Amino acid sequence: AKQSMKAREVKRVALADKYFAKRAELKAIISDVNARWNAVLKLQTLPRDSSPSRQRNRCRQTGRPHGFLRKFGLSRIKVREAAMRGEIPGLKKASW
Amino acid sequence: GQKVHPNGIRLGIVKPWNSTWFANTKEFADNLDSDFKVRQYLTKELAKASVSRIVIERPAKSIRVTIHTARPGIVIGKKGEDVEKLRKVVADIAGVPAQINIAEVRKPELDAKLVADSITSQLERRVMFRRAMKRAVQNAMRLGAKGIKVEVSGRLGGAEIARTEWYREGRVPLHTLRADIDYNTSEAHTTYGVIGVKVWIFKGEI
Amino acid sequence: RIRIRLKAFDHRLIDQATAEIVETAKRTGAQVRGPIPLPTRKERFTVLISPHVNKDARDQYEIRTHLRLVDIVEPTEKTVDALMRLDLAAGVDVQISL
Amino acid sequence: NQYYGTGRRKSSAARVFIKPGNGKIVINQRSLEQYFGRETARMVVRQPLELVDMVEKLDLYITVKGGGISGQAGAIRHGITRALMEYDESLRSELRKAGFVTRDARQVERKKVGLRKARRRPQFSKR
Amino acid sequence: PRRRVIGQRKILPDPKFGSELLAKFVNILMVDGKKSTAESIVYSALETLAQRSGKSELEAFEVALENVRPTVEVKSRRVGGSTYQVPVEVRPVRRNALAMRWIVEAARKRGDKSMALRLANELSDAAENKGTAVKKREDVHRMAEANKAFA
Amino acid sequence: SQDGTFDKLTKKEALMRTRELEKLENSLGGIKDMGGLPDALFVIDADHEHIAIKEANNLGIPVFAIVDTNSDPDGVDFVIPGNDDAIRAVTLYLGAVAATVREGRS
RNA sequence: AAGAACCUUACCUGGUCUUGACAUCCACGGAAGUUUUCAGAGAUGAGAAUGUGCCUUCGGGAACCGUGAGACAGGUGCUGCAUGGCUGUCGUCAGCUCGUGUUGUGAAAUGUUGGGUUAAGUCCCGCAACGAGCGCAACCCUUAUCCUUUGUUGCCAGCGGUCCGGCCGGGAACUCAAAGGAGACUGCCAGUGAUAAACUGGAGGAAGGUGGGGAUGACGUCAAGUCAUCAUGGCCCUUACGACCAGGGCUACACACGUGCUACAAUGGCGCAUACAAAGAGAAGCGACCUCGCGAGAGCAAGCGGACCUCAUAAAGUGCGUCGUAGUCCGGAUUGGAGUCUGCAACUCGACUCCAUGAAGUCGGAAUCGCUAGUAAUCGUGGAUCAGAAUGCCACGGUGAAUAC
Ligand SMILES: [Mg+2]
Ligand SMILES: [Mg+2]
Ligand SMILES: [Mg+2]
Ligand SMILES: [Mg+2]
Ligand SMILES: [Mg+2]
Ligand SMILES: [Mg+2]
Ligand SMILES: [Mg+2]
Ligand SMILES: [Mg+2]
Ligand SMILES: [Mg+2]
Ligand SMILES: [Mg+2]
Ligand SMILES: [Mg+2]
Ligand SMILES: [Mg+2]
Ligand SMILES: [Mg+2]
Ligand SMILES: [Mg+2]
Ligand SMILES: [Mg+2]
Ligand SMILES: [Mg+2]
Ligand SMILES: [Mg+2]
Ligand SMILES: [Mg+2]
Ligand SMILES: [Mg+2]
Ligand SMILES: [Mg+2]
Ligand SMILES: [Mg+2]
Ligand SMILES: [Mg+2]
Ligand SMILES: [Mg+2]
Ligand SMILES: [Mg+2]
Ligand SMILES: [Mg+2]
Ligand SMILES: [Mg+2]
Ligand SMILES: [Mg+2]
Ligand SMILES: [Mg+2]
Ligand SMILES: [Mg+2]
Question: Which domain of life is it from (chain F) (predicted)?
Answer without folding.
Answer: Bacteria
